Amino acid sequence: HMVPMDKTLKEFGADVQWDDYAQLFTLIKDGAYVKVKPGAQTAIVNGQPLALQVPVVMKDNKAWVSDTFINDVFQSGLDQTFQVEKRPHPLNALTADEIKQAVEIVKASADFKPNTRFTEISLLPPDKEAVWAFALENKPVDQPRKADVIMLDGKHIIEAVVDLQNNKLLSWQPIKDAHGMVLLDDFASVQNIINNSEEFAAAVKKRGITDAKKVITTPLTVGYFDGKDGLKQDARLLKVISYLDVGDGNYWAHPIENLVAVVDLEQKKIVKIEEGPVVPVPMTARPFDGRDRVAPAVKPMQIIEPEGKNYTITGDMIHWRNWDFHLSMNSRVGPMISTVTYNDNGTKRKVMYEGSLGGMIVPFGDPDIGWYFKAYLDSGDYGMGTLTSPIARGKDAPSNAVLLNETIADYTGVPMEIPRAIAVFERYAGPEYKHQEMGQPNVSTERRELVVRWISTVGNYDYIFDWIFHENGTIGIDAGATGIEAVKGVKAKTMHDETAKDDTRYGTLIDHNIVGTTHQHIYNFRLDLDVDGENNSLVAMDPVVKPNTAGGPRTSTMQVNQYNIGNEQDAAQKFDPGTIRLLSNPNKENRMGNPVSYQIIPYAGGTHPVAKGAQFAPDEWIYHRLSFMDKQLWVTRYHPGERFPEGKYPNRSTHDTGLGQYSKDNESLDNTDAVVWMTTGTTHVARAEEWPIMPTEWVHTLLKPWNFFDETPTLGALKKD
Amino acid sequence: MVPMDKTLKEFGADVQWDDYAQLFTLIKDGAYVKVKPGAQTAIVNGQPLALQVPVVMKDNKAWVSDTFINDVFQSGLDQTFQVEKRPHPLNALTADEIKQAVEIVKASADFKPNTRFTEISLLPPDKEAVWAFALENKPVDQPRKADVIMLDGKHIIEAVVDLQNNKLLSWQPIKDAHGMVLLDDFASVQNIINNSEEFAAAVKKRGITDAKKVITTPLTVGYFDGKDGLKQDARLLKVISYLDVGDGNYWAHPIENLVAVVDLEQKKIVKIEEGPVVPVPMTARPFDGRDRVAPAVKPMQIIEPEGKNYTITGDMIHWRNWDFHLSMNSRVGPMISTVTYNDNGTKRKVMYEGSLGGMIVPFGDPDIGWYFKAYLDSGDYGMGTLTSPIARGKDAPSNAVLLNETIADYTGVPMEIPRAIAVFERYAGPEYKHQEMGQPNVSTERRELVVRWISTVGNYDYIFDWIFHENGTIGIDAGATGIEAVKGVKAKTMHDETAKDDTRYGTLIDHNIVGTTHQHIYNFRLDLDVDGENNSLVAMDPVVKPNTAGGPRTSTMQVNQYNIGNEQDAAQKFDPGTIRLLSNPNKENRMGNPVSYQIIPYAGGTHPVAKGAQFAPDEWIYHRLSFMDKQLWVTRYHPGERFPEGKYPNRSTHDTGLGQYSKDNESLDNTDAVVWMTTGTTHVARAEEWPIMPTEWVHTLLKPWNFFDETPTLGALK
Ligand SMILES: [Ca+2]
Ligand SMILES: [Ca+2]
Ligand SMILES: [Ca+2]
Ligand SMILES: [Ca+2]
Ligand SMILES: [Cu+2]
Ligand SMILES: [Cu+2]
């Protein structure tokens, strides 16, 4: 017996194209590009013939395939994109079995508590030196696989370490005063609590809302105000902002302004309700899913690689041209790019040991009750890896992408597979280089970039991160922001209304009675670059205009002020895009005797106004707790336990436990293992073009080899000598 | 019959054979054809075509009738190009008009024997009439006219001819103006050096055994108030030399500290400047792959099997909600005109004309062969004329359409530049996306239409992309690649004695080779007409203000808004942290906000960014070219103000460009404004850019700001 081809292929996730003239089907799915003609005894997979016992059957215009067709074709072996890893990479994320094992161990602990949740369950970082030895020398890591198990018992944090190899608990340590991030059940809890609140229902009624069942809540961390917000620093709290569900699939467009409820998660009740002036809920329908729009006609455009990809995916190891790297997933920061090497004519040179999003923050600048405390620490407080948004094939990534699935642990300790978690794709990126000498044959080569894309959605905003590997050694890091804007309900319909001026003091009026409150998007990337070795130094090269002292008509010259940045404190700074900042290896030089290096560019451009630092006065608490938001470049000594710019437990934190803390002892950065942290952000002043849904806005960062190589890296293999 | 592979490939089409499907896939620009041997029909952009003669497979080689190409490729099924029945008034001069204009000036008794033409271009009707043709189909009732700029020896003469009536309207000698460098000047310079006994003498001293292997490069000399010892009235060129060692890259073998000054009218060297003797770097450093083998790569294609979403009628391009006219100019290249955005059925003005204004690449070395080095690419050399034909599939993606463009050469003869401009649509990530927890995802892909043009001047190749976003945004990117201008030095490594001094003005990128520091400064002239002619310049500076609303916050995020009323105040530095809008104070969007376009002169780049001119305010280049030190400029619309560096920048003694255009500090309140964006890079070289430099890019953007009332890409309502 057989099954309908289209339906089955679609279910499976493959693109199906029928060519009536050629009587040919073209099926695409990740690295598999297949061609099959009805009735043929063979199909083509990535240019190779594949025998089929049962041919594709065409009936009354309906195609049918056998029940084994998907597996026979798509798992044939002719698609070489993915290869089986023989020797497990030490950095492979915990498998589902390991996750379950780690949970069983802690639950077997005499101290374990029954309502305990898991904020994070991740592989405990094997020693960096052994990992590199494995990647470069293939030496086995003899230290046991261990996992960090961070638990939330009520409101108390407990860090546990388990030895998976020996199936035993190594440590169990309660972390005093730390608050746990927001967990999935916290969201349902807040909605329920609000739903059972008599007072809230009453507060809501006297604001126009009739059916309180139509109120949609969103949970926000409260931050820290040394008590000015009147909140017990000891309790596990969350503030709640509400919207009215009008049935347009966009509750974000119907704010119930000036109503904030504070919920105590352990007490499971509203401990405080802050009420302000009553502002009529913006009611007009403002769907963003196209239900009310005409579907435009567009001609097909496809990016195809008929013979397969140029990259190979062995286990989680990616090999592409001269690059080699390990790609894993973390529930808090998302994707982790490790042991990145560049194959320089046979010799694999180290570039980056570990790279990933450090952390990010989206702080608002409106002082009103529903906004003064708004500051989202997306990864830290909400867990971006966990909130990964599966890639919409052909839309969120090009049609020639390969989408990977990633596994992490949910808050209850149960393995969770995120489908299409990360997209991998090669893309044409203009001419790599070109030279059309007058009267001579032209010289041009195409540039190819390997992109690693991951999307995470937290409430109303969607963030896209691209790790771009250029064939020439450069590495790009871009962040895109899109989603639905956080708006403030206001009385003005237009800028001509009486309250307009006051309503727009902290944001643009982007719709009737709707203001897009100004805020910033501040991303921070933690890049443990190991420029051709562990021991590096930070060097500054500031292009300057110097008085000409060589004679001739010129009064000035362009020279450079080169100097080393010897410590963390001095390395923590603002980035002038007019200057050059290098992470060099003072122990290795290129053919011209120049130290092998990488130029760090925390600011390579963006489509929204650039954030020059935090848009907060120096006396603000958010400013105090989070110092990473005010400097674009930071450089610290390597420490396996320092991975977040905002600190490990940022929820309700009273002091900088992040980059402020990591650079506090102002250690030496001379010829030692350095870790670069790039902070880049935008200052978002809204406009109507961004409502009801915002067009993706991007920011770019770059890491370029500087004298790391001896010549143009993409010239090709030397034909002589 | 005729062999297919051979005939088609001669035609410029790509031929793909699929043995499993016994199908040929033929591609050329907007035509995507499928044909099976022996079939009575073929498919052209998804549509059936009856064939007179089926393709025939002989000895494993296909054969097609001698009428195949015409029948299939010109069948009418490929709708990419459409006939233009009523020519746009900005259409560039055709080959016939160029020959005609030349005959008109040649018929005058004032025309001298060996006069050359620096520029022959259309003298366009007034702006008001061009916009009415574009928006109301109103005929421009003006005769085709042309500006004919002649170079008589070293004398510039500007003439105007009436093409319809075939008559000369004016002949004006331009006092003190020096003409741009013309093609023949390259040859005279080399020839003049070749016949110089003295030059040969100086060359022999420097190690060059065969003076016939010496390659000259003509450079304009600038202006140094006589301090360079050069006569202000002579037509001069400075010559920098290299040694040809047979590696196809003379640029890698500089003959340092040797400069000759040639007087083009006397046809002789009038000065030889000599500095210390530095042995010519001899090592072969080819950049053409003769000594390399590239790694094999799996094929990748970008296909549009049913044709393009854009239509090209004459030079009028229509794509999604955009409409614009693309023409070519011999001096600045591509001109984007009468740009409108179709807002739900109504065409709204966005930009009257946009194009490269001018650009400069000034060096920072004081030495003999570098102190005067400053290339005014379009101005002194003619970038349109020097356009580099796009290498299909490489300089532009495989799904691009390559357009041919016509300009007049220096002798007044029409020259068709093949594949002069690339037009292509491209996937650019998600236009927007929102994955609401627990709900069906919402995502749409972003499509951008790019207009790409490449011009090469001497050793450097510049790529320009005019990018139209479906959502109303317009991007303008500038890429730089080519061969670096290097200085010969004695140091081989940084461990050598002269290393420190050899690298004072640039990086040691190869043994004995220093990539001299310099800047790349591009300037774009954008006659934006935001939803109309009358606009105003508005500043919006995000600031931190004390909270006065109560609550725990000590500060707030607010905006300082204010109009910039005059040209002098509009000439400014650009803080990427601020917002600069060109608003139309007479029209507002649904929320009462003035429809506007946000101007961003600096949206990013891959090389260090130029904050201004890396020159002391007393340098002559600094004085001559004010445009290099300010990122934003706004002036009153004037049809004769088109170049930031001035109309005749060769040896200019003062700013006749933007410095002159903003001179009178006129009012920019509710009037026709012209935006000029200066964007540049400061280049400090590295070994990874030698012998050939990987393309470096700079980005700029023009975004609609309350021009619309909502997300522009959602679509029309049902
Ligand atoms: Ca430290
Ligand atoms: Ca390091
Ligand atoms: Ca204008
Ligand atoms: Ca003026
Ligand atoms: Cu935003
Ligand atoms: Cu350069």
For A471, which residue in chain B has the nearest alpha carbon?
B694
**For residue B292, what is the enclosing H or E element?**
strand B292-293
Q: Judge contact between A689 and B706, C-beta under 8 A.
A: yes
Give A249's contacts in chain B (Cβ within 8 Å). Answer: 436, 439
Token digits of residue A518: 């100004």
**Helix, strand, or coil here: B69?**
helix
Peptide bond preceding B124: is omega within 30 degrees of 0, i.e. cis? Answer: no
Q: Judge contact between B578 and B542, C-beta under 8 A.
A: yes
Q: Judge contact between B546 and A619, C-beta under 8 A.
A: no
Q: What is the rounded radius of gyration, in angstroms, for the C-alpha atoms of chain B?
A: 28
Token digits of residue A703: 């890491």
CA of B637 from ligand 3 middle (Å) equals: 6
- A30 to chain B nearest CA, in Å? 14
CA of A117 from ligand 5 middle (Å) equals: 32
- Which H, E and C letters describe A165-199, residue by residue? CCCEEEEEEEECCCCCCCCHHHHHHHHHHHHHCHH
At position B228, the amino acid (one-letter code) is D
- Which H, E and C letters describe B213-272, residue by residue? HEEEEEECCCCCCCCCCCCCCCCEEEEEEEECCCCCCHHHCEEEEEEEEEECCCCEEEEE
Could you say which DSSP state residue A134 is in? H
Token digits of residue A229: 């917000």
What are the C-alpha distances in Å from B701 to residues A462, A521, A696, B444, B677?
Answer: 23, 20, 14, 22, 10
Residue B486: closest CA among B285, B332, B222, B190: B285
| Region(s) of chain A under CATH 3.10.450.40 | 81-181, 182-287
Q: Judge contact between B659 and B568, C-beta under 8 A.
A: no
List binding-site positions of A for Ca(2+): 528-530, 568, 662, 665, 667, 673-674
Distance CA B411, CA A11 (A): 66
Residue B206: count of CB within 10 angstroms of its CB: 19
CA of A351 from ligand 2 middle (Å) equals: 9
Distance CA B524, CA B351 (A): 13
Cross-chain Cβ contact A550/B366 below 8 Å: yes
CATH fold of B80-180 reads Nuclear Transport Factor 2; Chain: A, (3.10.450)
Give B517's contacts in chain A (Cβ within 8 Å). Answer: 543, 558-560
Question: Sign (positive/negative) of CA torsion B192, B197, B198, B199?
Answer: positive
Instruction: Provide, for chain B, the percentages of residues in helix, strand and coil under a 3-state DSSP scheme, each rounded to the nearest 5.
Output: 15, 45, 45
What are the C-alpha distances in Å from B312 to residues B309, B424, B471?
Answer: 10, 12, 21
Parallel, antiparallel or unpaired: strands A42-45 and A32-36: antiparallel
Top residue of B34, B292, B300 to mutate, by most chain A CBs within 10 Å, is B300
* B647-650, long-range: CB < 8 A, 24+ apart: B647/B177, B648/B156, B648/B174, B648/B177, B648/B178, B648/B179, B649/B358, B649/B376, B649/B379, B649/B380, B649/B624, B649/B625, B650/B177, B650/B178, B650/B179, B650/B180, B650/B181, B650/B220, B650/B376, B650/B379, B650/B380
Answer yes or no: A511 catalytic: no
Q: Judge contact between A371 and A517, C-beta under 8 A.
A: yes
Q: Number of helices and strands (H, E) in chain A?
A: 10, 41
Q: Which CATH superfamily is domain B308-717 in?
A: Copper amine oxidase, catalytic domain (2.70.98.20)
What are the C-alpha distances in Å from A606 to residues A385, A521, A601, B557, B700?
Answer: 24, 12, 13, 20, 10
What are the C-alpha distances in Å from A170 to residues A91, A242, B541, B693?
Answer: 20, 44, 55, 54
CA of B330 from ligand 5 middle (Å) equals: 43
Cross-chain Cβ contact B593/A506 below 8 Å: no
Which single residue is written with the structure tokens 């002038």?
Answer: A576
Residue B285: closest CA among B7, B15, B484, B26: B484
Residue A227: count of CB within 10 angstroms of its CB: 10
Q: Judge contact between B252 and B691, C-beta under 8 A.
A: yes
Q: CATH code for B181-286?
A: 3.10.450.40
At position B296, the amino acid (one-letter code) is A
At position A417, the amino acid (one-letter code) is E
Distance CA B642, CA B657 (A): 8
Residue B472: count of CB within 10 angstroms of its CB: 23
Distance CA A397, CA A399 (A): 7
What are the C-alpha distances in Å from A716 to residues A312, A579, A591, B296, B473?
Answer: 21, 31, 18, 11, 38
| Region(s) of chain B under CATH 2.70.98.20 | 308-717
Residue A66: count of CB within 10 angstroms of its CB: 17
List binding-site positions of A: 376-387, 458-463, 519, 521, 528-530, 568, 662, 665, 667, 673-674, 684
- A655 to chain B nearest CA, in Å? 17
Question: Which of B471, B511, B602 is opposite residue A592, by nearest beta carbon?
Answer: B511
Could you say which DSSP state residue A200 is in? H
**Helix, strand, or coil here: B107?**
coil
Distance CA B711, CA A690 (A): 5
Distance CA A658, CA A354 (A): 18
**For residue B5, what is the enclosing H or E element?**
helix B4-11
Distance CA A240, CA A459 (A): 13
Parallel, antiparallel or unpaired: strands A595-601 and A633-637: unpaired
Give B367's contacts in chain A (Cβ within 8 Å). Answer: 550, 552
Catalytic residue among A311, A461, A523, A649: A461
Distance CA A409, CA A99 (A): 7
List binding-site positions of B: 375-386, 457-462, 518, 520, 527-529, 567, 661, 664, 666, 672-673, 683
**Helix, strand, or coil here: B621?**
helix
For B117-175, the DSSP string reads EEEEEEEPPPHHHHHHHHHH-PPP-S--EEEEEEEETTEEEEEEEETTTTEEEEEEE-T
Cross-chain Cβ contact B592/A293 below 8 Å: no
Give B78's contacts in chain A (Cβ within 8 Å). Answer: none
**Helix, strand, or coil here: A275?**
strand
Burial class for A187, CB neighbours closer than 10 Å (0-12, 13-18, 19+) = middle
Distance CA A279, CA A492 (A): 10
Distance CA A473, CA A708 (A): 9
Distance CA B621, CA B639 (A): 26
Cross-chain Cβ contact A394/B445 below 8 Å: yes
- B167 to chain A nearest CA, in Å? 37
Q: Which CATH superfamily is domain A309-718 in?
A: Copper amine oxidase, catalytic domain (2.70.98.20)
| Region(s) of chain B under CATH 3.30.457.10 | 1-78
**For residue B103, what is the enclosing H or E element?**
helix B95-106
Nearest ligand, CA B351: 3
At position B322, the amino acid (one-letter code) is W
Question: Sign (positive/negative) of CA torsion A489, A492, A498, A502?
Answer: positive
Distance CA A550, CA A545 (A): 14
Could you say which DSSP state residue A381 is in? I
Distance CA A320, CA A313 (A): 9
Question: Sign (positive/negative) of CA torsion B205, B207, B213, B217?
Answer: negative
Top residue of B442, B483, B493 to mutate, by most chain A CBs within 10 Å, is B442
Question: Which of B289, B430, B684 is opposite residue A396, by nearest beta carbon?
Answer: B430
Catalytic center residues of B: 377, 460
Contact residues for A355 (Cβ-Cβ < 8 A; gap 6+): A336, A337, A338, A340, A467, A525, A526, A527, A528, A529
Token digits of residue A65: 């395939």
Residue A100: closest CA among A119, A121, A120: A121
* A1-5, long-range: CB < 8 A, 24+ apart: A1/A67, A2/A54, A2/A57, A2/A64, A2/A65, A2/A66, A2/A67, A3/A64, A3/A65, A3/A66, A3/A67, A4/A62, A4/A63, A4/A64, A5/A56, A5/A62, A5/A63, A5/A64, A5/A65, A5/A69
Cross-chain Cβ contact B224/A430 below 8 Å: no
Question: Which of A446, A462, A548 is opposite residue B435, by nearest beta carbon?
Answer: A462
Q: Judge contact between B683 and B519, C-beta under 8 A.
A: yes
Question: Which of A225, A493, A617 is opposite residue B555, by nearest beta carbon?
Answer: A617
Classify the phi-psi angles of B405: left when phi > 0, otherwise alpha if psi is within -120 to 50, otherwise beta.
beta
Token digits of residue B419: 């594949």
Distance CA B1, CA B52 (A): 12
What are the C-alpha distances in Å from A354 to residues A328, A357, A480, B122, B297?
Answer: 11, 10, 22, 58, 28
Q: Judge contact between A321 and B295, C-beta under 8 A.
A: yes
At position A661, the amino acid (one-letter code) is Q
Catalytic residue among A378, A478, A503, A532: A378
Nearest ligand, CA B633: 4
Q: Judge contact between B516 and B505, C-beta under 8 A.
A: yes
Q: Determined by which method? A: X-ray
Question: Which of A552, A615, A706 is opposite residue B368, by nearest beta carbon?
Answer: A552
CB pairs < 8 Å spanning A and B: 500
Q: What is the rounded radius of gyration, in angstroms, for the C-alpha atoms of chain A?
A: 28
Q: What are phi and psi of A482, to 5 degrees?
A: -155, -170
Q: Judge contact between B324 and B347, C-beta under 8 A.
A: no
Token digits of residue B656: 């006749």
| Region(s) of chain A under CATH 3.30.457.10 | 1-79
| Region(s) of chain A under CATH 2.70.98.20 | 309-718
Classify the phi-psi angles of A101: left when phi > 0, otherwise alpha if psi is within -120 to 50, otherwise beta.
alpha
Which residues lie across from B506 on neighbouring strands? B516
Q: Which listed CATH number (3.30.457.10, 3.30.56.10, 3.40.50.300, 3.30.420.40) goes with A1-79?
A: 3.30.457.10
Q: CATH code for A182-287?
A: 3.10.450.40
Distance CA A435, CA A392 (A): 39
For A81, which residue in chain B has the nearest alpha carbon?
B298
| Region(s) of chain B under CATH 3.10.450.40 | 80-180, 181-286
Q: Which CATH class is domain A81-181?
A: alpha beta
What are the C-alpha distances in Å from A557 to residues B142, B505, B521?
Answer: 52, 7, 17
C-alpha A283: how far from its chain's center? 34
Token digits of residue B436: 């609401």
Which residues lie across from A274 on neighbouring strands? A260
Classify the phi-psi angles of A657: left when phi > 0, otherwise alpha if psi is within -120 to 50, otherwise beta.
alpha
Question: Sign (positive/negative) of CA torsion B704, B706, B711, B717?
Answer: negative
Could you say which DSSP state residue A276 is in? -
- A160 to chain B nearest CA, in Å? 30
Q: Judge contact between B255 and B656, C-beta under 8 A.
A: no
Q: Judge contact between A222 and A239, C-beta under 8 A.
A: yes
Cross-chain Cβ contact A299/B304 below 8 Å: yes
Give exposure, A658-674, as e/b (b: 16+ Cβ within 10 Å): bbbebbeeebebeeebb
Question: Which of B227, B433, B693 is opposite residue A553, by nearest beta carbon?
Answer: B227
Nearest ligand, CA B640: 4
Q: Judge contact between B338 and B325, C-beta under 8 A.
A: yes
Nearest ligand, CA B526: 3
Token digits of residue A129: 């030196």
Cross-chain Cβ contact B371/A552 below 8 Å: yes
Contact residues for A398 (Cβ-Cβ < 8 A; gap 6+): A303, A425, A427, B427
Which residues lie across from B520 on neighbouring strands? B681
Distance CA B35, CA A504 (A): 62
Beta strands in A268-397 (DSSP E): 269-275, 302-304, 311-314, 317-320, 323-330, 334-344, 347-363, 375-376
Residue A677: closest CA among A387, A178, A333: A333
Token digits of residue B494: 């940084």
List binding-site positions of B for Ca(2+): 527-529, 567, 661, 664, 666, 672-673
- A326 to chain B nearest CA, in Å? 22
Residue A239: closest CA among A205, A265, A210: A265
Contact residues for B480 (Cβ-Cβ < 8 A; gap 6+): B460, B461, B462, B463, B520, B607, B681, B693, B695, B696, B697, B698
What are the C-alpha distances in Å from A315 to residues A81, A97, A128, A310?
Answer: 11, 16, 20, 16
Q: Judge contact between A714 and A620, C-beta under 8 A.
A: no
Distance CA A123, CA A150 (A): 11
Largest CA distance in chain A: 91
Cross-chain Cβ contact A447/B694 below 8 Å: yes
CA of A554 from ligand 6 middle (Å) equals: 20
CA of A643 from ligand 1 middle (Å) equals: 12
CATH fold of B1-78 reads Copper Amine Oxidase; Chain A, domain 1 (3.30.457)
Query: Within 13 Å of residue B579, how many CA atoms lie on the same side as its CB?
Result: 27
What are the C-alpha distances in Å from A116 to residues A189, A314, B194?
Answer: 16, 36, 89
Question: Which of A366, A554, A688 is opposite residue B709, by nearest beta carbon?
Answer: A688
- Which H, E and C letters describe A443-460, residue by residue? EEEEEEEEEEEEEEEECC
C-alpha A373: how far from its chain's center? 24
C-alpha A434: how far from its chain's center? 34
Give exposure, B57-72, as e/b (b: 16+ Cβ within 10 Å): eeeeebbbbeebbebb
**For residue A12, what is the enclosing H or E element?**
helix A5-12
**Helix, strand, or coil here: B623?**
helix
Distance CA A88, CA A317 (A): 10
Residue A462: closest CA among A566, A528, A382: A382
Question: Which of A310, A438, A591 is opposite residue B298, by nearest beta carbon?
Answer: A310
Q: Judge contact between A476 and A351, C-beta under 8 A.
A: no
Give A594's contacts in chain B (Cβ within 8 Å). Answer: 494, 507-508, 687
Give A32's contacts in chain B (Cβ within 8 Å). Answer: none
CA of B426 from ligand 3 middle (Å) equals: 29
Residue A480: count of CB within 10 angstroms of its CB: 20
Token digits of residue A10: 């679609």
Contact residues for B623 (Cβ-Cβ < 8 A; gap 6+): B617, B654, B655
Classify the phi-psi angles of B257: left when phi > 0, otherwise alpha if psi is within -120 to 50, otherwise beta.
left
CA of A661 from ligand 1 middle (Å) equals: 8
CA of B406 from ligand 2 middle (Å) equals: 55
Q: Judge contact between A714 and B694, C-beta under 8 A.
A: yes
Distance CA A467, CA A448 (A): 14
